[PDB]
Amino acid sequence: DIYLPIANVARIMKNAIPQTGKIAKDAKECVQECVSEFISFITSEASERCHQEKRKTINGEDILFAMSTLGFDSYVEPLKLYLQKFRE
Amino acid sequence: RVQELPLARIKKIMKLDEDVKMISAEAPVLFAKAAQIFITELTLRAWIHTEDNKRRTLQRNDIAMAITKFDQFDFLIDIVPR
């Protein structure tokens, strides 16, 4: 069981609800589990794409293909922008 | 700030799949942003059920309910069942 740090997860959650809203510890842990499941789900499809393209290292295009294929196409443009800004 | 998320941890999660051995440097960066977008949408959707129940505390059952209402979350149906 490998998860993103609970405090980082909780901070992102808190930003999405009213200032006085509260989050049960068990709900934070649940979202931790869900995020790892999300990473694994996308990565599995990206791995298949990588192999199909005669490669061995899963790249950004593989991840984006996976997101589009698996019902997360709306993530593609924001992700491309974020990566561009990150490397610029 | 999405840039705050630990990329080594994201890479470790990816590598839990035994078939996943080599990962580009850029892939964890993409996942850091994706994780923020995903957590935000999942939390917002759970909070719909929190508010519907006139509660101020978001609970696991609210997340379970949200998962059933969005086919993008189909992959989580058996992870967080109602």
Side-chain angles (χ1 to χ4, degrees):
Chain A
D1 289 336
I2 305 307
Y3 307 119
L4 293 175
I6 192 168
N8 294 126
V9 173
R11 185 166 300 106
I12 299 167
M13 294 177 75
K14 190 61 214 60
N15 289 341
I17 71 174
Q19 290 192 39
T20 66
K22 297 181 279 202
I23 309 164
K25 180 178 179 172
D26 179 59
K28 295 174 187 178
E29 293 169 351
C30 179
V31 174
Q32 272 187 126
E33 297 156 35
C34 289
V35 172
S36 285
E37 197 74 21
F38 172 70
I39 293 166
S40 298
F41 179 44
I42 301 307
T43 296
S44 291
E45 186 60 27
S47 182
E48 183 65 38
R49 174 66 174 187
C50 178
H51 188 262
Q52 288 295 317
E53 294 288 282
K54 299 184 183 72
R55 288 179 287 99
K56 293 199 175 170
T57 295
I58 298 167
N59 72 16
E61 287 191 5
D62 297 329
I63 298 298
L64 297 174
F65 169 93
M67 287 170 180
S68 192
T69 296
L70 298 176
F72 308 92
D73 189 69
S74 72
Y75 285 53
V76 173
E77 292 312 313
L79 262 53
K80 287 175 166 182
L81 184 56
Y82 180 77
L83 177 59
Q84 172 172 72
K85 291 181 179 155
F86 192 89
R87 299 196 294 199
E88 71 178 15
Chain B
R1 187 162 187 163
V2 175
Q3 304 95 280
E4 56 95 334
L5 292 162
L7 300 177
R9 190 73 63 83
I10 294 169
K11 188 174 191 185
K12 189 168 185 184
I13 294 163
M14 293 179 72
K15 287 195 159 185
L16 287 171
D17 188 332
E18 292 161 40
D19 285 344
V20 174
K21 24 43 235 160
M22 310 167 65
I23 302 163
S24 62
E26 64 200 352
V29 177
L30 292 166
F31 275 125
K33 181 62 177 176
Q36 185 227 41
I37 295 170
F38 173 79
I39 293 160
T40 299
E41 186 74 15
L42 180 61
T43 302
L44 186 161
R45 285 170 175 269
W47 186 262
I48 293 162
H49 307 295
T50 309
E51 279 206 2
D52 191 36
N53 284 286
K54 308 296 186 167
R55 277 191 276 101
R56 298 302 286 177
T57 302
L58 196 159
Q59 298 175 170
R60 175 180 298 256
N61 69 313
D62 300 325
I63 299 165
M65 179 66 144
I67 287 160
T68 71
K69 300 297 179 158
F70 192 27
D71 48 19
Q72 192 183 81
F73 295 163
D74 278 357
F75 75 103
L76 297 168
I77 277 144
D78 294 330
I79 304 305
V80 195
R82 291 196 66 199

